[PDB]
Design an enzyme around this catalytic site. Structure first.
Site: not given
Ligand SMILES: O=C1C(=O)N(Cc2ccccc2)c2ccccc21
Ligand SMILES: O=C1C(=O)N(Cc2ccccc2)c2ccccc21
Ligand code: NA
Ligand code: NA
Ligand code: NA
Ligand code: NA
Lengths: 494, 494, 494, 494
Positions: D186, D239, D243-244, D262, D296, D393
């Site tokens: 999805k 996400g 939502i998780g 994640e 994230c 966040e």
């Molecule tokens: O700071 C981040 C980030 O959180 N993610 C994705 C992420 C998603 C879930 C959990 C942790 C990281 C990234 C991907 C590429 C470059 C920088 C970053």
């Protein structure tokens, strides 16, 4: 080869264990715990509630404090403390085998030779892992150095069942403590004694205050309290698939705590025509009747091939009628009582529906004594896939024998369940064993055996039999959290 | 469907390879390589001696230097290079397969589809490992943080035999380069050509200069110069059991360099009565006659149980007599010539020795063509353990068929040997295949198959068949040097 | 935590140890073992040779026969026998810490609290590995099922030095038995006693006859007899380099037995300008003066950065004069005598060679008592690389301090050496510890500490300080023979 | 050097991808996806609901059937197919970057050089794992041979977010396909374009039909349809917490499917005093503003030591002030627009709430542009713990700066967010490095760097941030089912 038992042992512990001391419930409520052989009450036990679980967790959260003597101690010493706990269980072997039989009802010969032995090998297997689960150094791109730490996930809620109350206890404590966690344990209302006494041995072994807390109580109060608790980092539940659905729902409606589950099964035992008839008959019988049939991976669908169906049945029946039901402390007893009133009636009801739906009752079917919860060894033949006795885990001494034509047929049928904890194949033929060992959907497949567990071999389920693995090295993953550290360095050289 | 081979491919590469550049020998000497199908000279190759090996080793050491492109390059990138190298070998697959057949004598069709395919798969498999060989973080006592680094061993001397020139080159470069080592390779004087053309591809693929250097020449000179070199950290030899001894001595005499050996064997192929007769015959025949018998793991001792011996012999002889010998560029041919006059005479002698000691000649046992080095497929029946042909490796198209009664008898008979590379068992029974796969002292046990290698699955000797292992994760161990870093930290927590 | 010692404790054990029983030599010769505190004969000990060794191997072989008690024993049981042994050594730890201090020479306090504590940690660590060294299942190409078995290598000749004769014994026996090999151990002629008593605990522990064997004597006969035995599978040797080269030649000229070696060292300890002065000073001191300078990774090259050279040197010279030398059974004593007179004179000859070459003798000098083998703690200053006391292994209580200016400098100066056992780095900076720990060519690098071992963290030599590793999961590698079983199965599905 | 963009790239794929073919929804509805740098609807995309998810699932189940092309492929071939896929993406690297920037906001010089670089490394790294994830052979007690099979978990439902579209597709397909599973995917309604182009390449590469299936749709509809299917073995969400926690409930409510997650975080970027300032400032500025702050594990809790705050904070505002906003297809543009309206006013909604309760606004403030969802880089100071800005966040270009004193202090502060996905430590000193990385609660701890992801190093959060890790050897566990086979054998030896 088997010492004598005390048949009326002294009960020493019947309370909530926290910070290595004994507590009565906040509410002061209690519950009796019964002896399934006579139906009589053994003693009263502290009924832990919502707020007694909240207590257990804070003494545990404090055992896990950065700087605490448990967080600080050497990994190989956590081993030394596991080994110590097994030394003392070995010391009190007889008393613990007797106490398990008094509250659970399994034959005394099995409690001593099977349960407590596998208690000993399990605990001693994890002791030696304490200082052997490695993280990784990882050759990332760029001028960095990166590596992983396998840290303890933290405060682990463990809910254990009544069938193997010591062996389940050790299967849960094995890895949790090896890896540095701390545990809030909820024992089953049915069999809460043996566990609370080992809590005294956990004191005497030298485990810091609040490493292990054990809360007796009911599922809907204590159980559900741990599963909901906002500061519990992980919760492991073994028991019915029904109740597992409440555990995974509460764990989502709380604090995103990790989950593991070990639910029931309708595990097929598949006998091909070339099997060793005599071996396969003693093993199919054992596979289902073991521990009064109260086995998550009891072989409750015995699929037999047509060329040999009739001889197999006649033999199974003969073996079934010659199984001795009686006083579990008596050396000759092969089958003791079921666990409580509730299981007794539930089984009789399944037997009832086996009869209603047209299965052939071939022996047993009845109540096996005047006093207690003893059920006769029962065998049904000509079972079809659509019958209630071929879909639902009875968890008692009730064997179902089904006939099959081809190997492509029996694989589709065997794999046609909501469960997949275990399965077994009996055959002398190498291609057959290999085809089936691969094609079957089960956490564990056995070839020319059954219920062969070692502390070394991992165990879990597929589908709705659960998720994650117990025993072996795999048992360590769900009790570990992975932390990555990535350090800028001057210049990365291979 | 294999493309049409150019039966006289041109030679572009016939010199010494050092630093991605091509060189004549310091003495400007050359030697001729021969076509064993015709006995005529293909061309002249540069003869490396001590001076050239010392030059190559110096280039290699220069490339291993801390802060060199090879040492700074990311591990994922070492893997890209091997994938690029693999794609160039596939691009030029038709030529290489023609050149191998010209120089070595194996059938073009086998060269194309077996040998060239395994080279690509091996090189692709190791491309993936390059960034996947983790060290460990270790839970050590006291307030310390401890971890291992898998660093390369350094300058790796590799000596490759003639029976499988390209494949042996990939089995040594694959794992050496994926771990970040640098290599100095001695190829065999019977078949240097394919390896020098691949060096040409090594340069195209982008490998920093000095990472791979290749020295064609003779063994008692170039080969010993590598084994005795003071700046070579490691030597990998594959060849005769007799020369391997020389390789381990020089290494003791020089700088205590590391060593792994793959040596010859006299591998047992065991066939029970309940084995699928037609499959066993076709496989046993392939097990011995593959590559003109020139296989370290050749099934050169075919034990057969007494109930099936007669029929097995009669079928085996038949397939031996219809095996087609001739030009290896023709698609009808299943057997080209032996590699040179020495092995030719050696095999001719070993067949005469056969006849002398009382083995029954059932077919062949003489010469097949008036030019080149062709020998007739030979089968010897009623072979006994004490016979020289049962005890020493002919390395030729000469089958020994022995007879046994019980499974236990043949375990001691198969094992009583100073060699232990490989073994095979043909049966349908689960228990027998396990009993024998457990009892045979062999680094590889094939069940109902033979010569099945994976790039993924380790291969190597027991006893005097060698030490160390090749392919799989295991192939990386002998090319890695472990470094432990142990740092004092303020306060260790779990 | 230190008891009191019987300082001429009864010698119950001074013979050859085969099949859990005692023997004289076939020649009936004997030799004396000396006390280094006094120089008197402690007792006679039987002098084995080619003849006796040849009887040990034949007992070791028979206990390793397929179907023997040691072979068929559970993997978990080997762990129980090791864990038992640890419990027995802990029960005679006081007699052992004394008999160690008596025959070797080191301080009783260090013997009891360091040596045997590590010996017990070693044996209990390896206990746990016994049922944990998994093989693999491998997803090969085609319709096959491929897996590996980690099998014991066989009869392992083990030869151990005189500087840690208990601990060295445990470092060898731990791995060898955990993976189920049989041992033929030659012990040091200067410290045979301890190894012999521990054997009696091995019998008492319950290990089968012919599993662990011991032949005291002289290397140039028995030592080399183990090395050249046509039927010894493996020879681990710890000691000097010269002997290691002899060993690796004896393997090459005989049965191609696998070989690991732990050899010498000239380990560098490196103080950066931003180290912790006091800590660094005290650690540097222990780093060389531990075990009377008879450690393989003794920090016998102290590199000090120039800004702090003067400051460091005085403290170290002051710290070295403060170091009490006397009877090891005393508790003021920090340093006892050297092991025998042969080393006594070697180190004296080294100290003269130092002054003679213009090194500044800054304290110490020569002999420190008129009976025994006692030498003064000795610091040389302003030392240079081209000096004999900075290149050759003295193996005694003689320090060496060298001035450097840059981090790039000391990298090159510390590596430029034919050994590579250990090194240490003292610094407060992160980038510097990382730069150095990457760039040092040592098998172990300690950061803000020295001499921090544990059964957990692997140990061994780069270049010519060794081949192969001991301790950790890495130790088991050398003691295992890997076997691949590859099975044709009906249809491969992921 | 970065190839010339196509500022308005063509679009080919907007439909549902099932069985290697395209389909409009059942209800035939569509929806809009916006070019958030202008705000004009790029194109229409089939609006997926439950019933189209049930067609994809059936298509996947058929593809996962025993005997199918996918399930019978050599593990190495799947690796070949992932590498093939990566080669197709690389050939189209220019265009995919442009399409990604279009629908996402991010600068072209990031889409091409970073996002797509990381896509390629991830797929290639995983292609390498395809045939190297081994199961175990286990040394169990008794006469059994026990071994584990690492089997595909099954039909995995994969929901990925909009913040790093292509990369997040890469992190899910890589591990899942390497281990032989089948995918129901999805994609985000905001960014379905790129992730749908890759499916066309998946077809071209040659992946059998139904191995991967992709369904654009809604969070309330498609999301929970996948999460609730009775035939989806496993679901991985990526996400936010709200939502998780719906995903965990609906999976239990359905068929107890496996769940990995994640989720968001409030990642603390701790700048120490003795650290470098140029590097810390630039990197701390990298930690948050990257990818328009839609990140994230973005660093938004910056604990500076009170020896440097002022001087640190000084440089911190200039660089932030000078950070360019603009058209995403202009090479000087560091920052693009936010992806949707909701986030825009929400990020503005977050800003207001800060200053309200004591927060100094140091630059930017609000709306960057007339046309689009752009935002000027806002920065706060003087921030304390209990505020809305230092707890929730923001997912946008809005820095917070906090202040601390002692090293024990900041830990407790750092360990007081209901999250913990990543963290960081800018220091020079070894001890402050090892302490802070050892006691911060976080999945990744970057030292002197930030947002360093290797394809090799695992990645996932503590507590509420997620279960399991993505990337590394630990990525494969989630996608793997462990089966144990335990076989009775004649006589177990070692
Ligand atoms: O700071 C981040 C980030 O959180 N993610 C994705 C992420 C998603 C879930 C959990 C942790 C990281 C990234 C991907 C590429 C470059 C920088 C970053
Ligand atoms: O049937 C079972 C069983 O479930 N366990 C323990 C178990 C508990 C939960 C999940 C799987 C196994 C057993 C242990 C020994 C012998 C028979 C059995
Ligand atoms: Na009860
Ligand atoms: Na030739
Ligand atoms: Na002595
Ligand atoms: Na635009």
């Amino acid at each position: 080869a088997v010492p004598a038992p005390n048949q009326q042992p002294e009960v020493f512990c019947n309370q909530i264990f926290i910070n290595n001391e004994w507590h009565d419930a906040v509410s002061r409520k209690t519950f009796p715990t019964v002896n399934p052989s006579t139906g009589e009450v053994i003693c009263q036990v502290a009924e832990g509630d919502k707020e007694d679980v909240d207590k257990a967790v804070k003494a545990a959260r404090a055992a896990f404090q950065l700087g605490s003597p448990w967080r600080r101690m050497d990994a190989s010493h956590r081993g030394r403390l596991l080994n110590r706990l097994a030394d003392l269980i070995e010391r009190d072997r007889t008393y613990l085998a007797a106490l398990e039989t008094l509250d659970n009802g399994k034959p005394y010969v099995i409690s001593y030779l099977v349960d407590l032995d596998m208690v000993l090998k399990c605990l001693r297997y994890y002791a030696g892992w304490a200082d052997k689960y490695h993280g990784k150094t990882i050759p990332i791109d760029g001028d960095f150095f990166s590596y992983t730490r396998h840290e303890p996930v933290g405060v682990c809620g463990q809910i254990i069942p009544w069938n193997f109350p010591l062996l389940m206890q050790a299967w849960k404590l094995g890895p949790a403590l090896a890896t540095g966690n701390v545990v809030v344990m909820k024992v089953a209302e049915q069999t809460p004694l043996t566990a609370l006494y080992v809590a005294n041995l956990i004191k005497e072994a030298g485990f810091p205050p609040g490493v292990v807390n054990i809360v007796p109580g009911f599922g809907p109060t204590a159980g559900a309290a741990i599963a909901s608790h906002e500061d519990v980092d992980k919760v492991a539940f073994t028991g019915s698939t029904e109740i597992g659905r409440v555990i995974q729902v509460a764990a989502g409606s709380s604090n995103l705590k990790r989950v593991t589950l070990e639910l029931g099964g309708k595990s097929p035992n598949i006998i091909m025509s070339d099997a060793d008839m005599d071996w396969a008959v003693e093993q199919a019988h054992f596979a289902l009747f073991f521990n009064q049939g109260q086995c998550c991976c009891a072989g409750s669908r015995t699929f037999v091939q047509e060329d040999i169906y009739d001889e197999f049945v006649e033999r199974s029946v003969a073996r079934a009628k010659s199984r001795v039901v009686g006083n579990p402390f008596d050396s000759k007893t092969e089958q003791g009582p079921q666990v409580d009133e509730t299981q007794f009636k539930k089984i009789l009801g399944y037997i009832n529906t086996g009869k209603q739906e047209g299965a052939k009752l071939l022996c047993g079917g009845g109540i096996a004594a005047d006093r207690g919860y003893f059920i006769q060894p029962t065998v049904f033949g000509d079972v079809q896939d659509g019958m209630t006795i071929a879909k639902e885990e009875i968890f008692g001494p009730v064997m179902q024998i089904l006939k099959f034509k081809t190997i492509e047929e029996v694989v589709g049928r065997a794999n046609n369940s909501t469960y997949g904890l275990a399965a077994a194949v009996f055959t002398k033929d190498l291609d057959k064993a290999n085809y089936l060992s691969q094609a079957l959907q089960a956490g564990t497949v056995w070839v020319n055996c059954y219920d062969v567990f070692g502390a070394q071999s991992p165990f879990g389920g597929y589908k709705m039999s659960g998720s994650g693995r117990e025993l072996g090295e795999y048992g360590l993953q769900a009790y570990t959290e992975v932390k990555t550290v990535t350090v800028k360095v001057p210049q990365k050289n291979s």
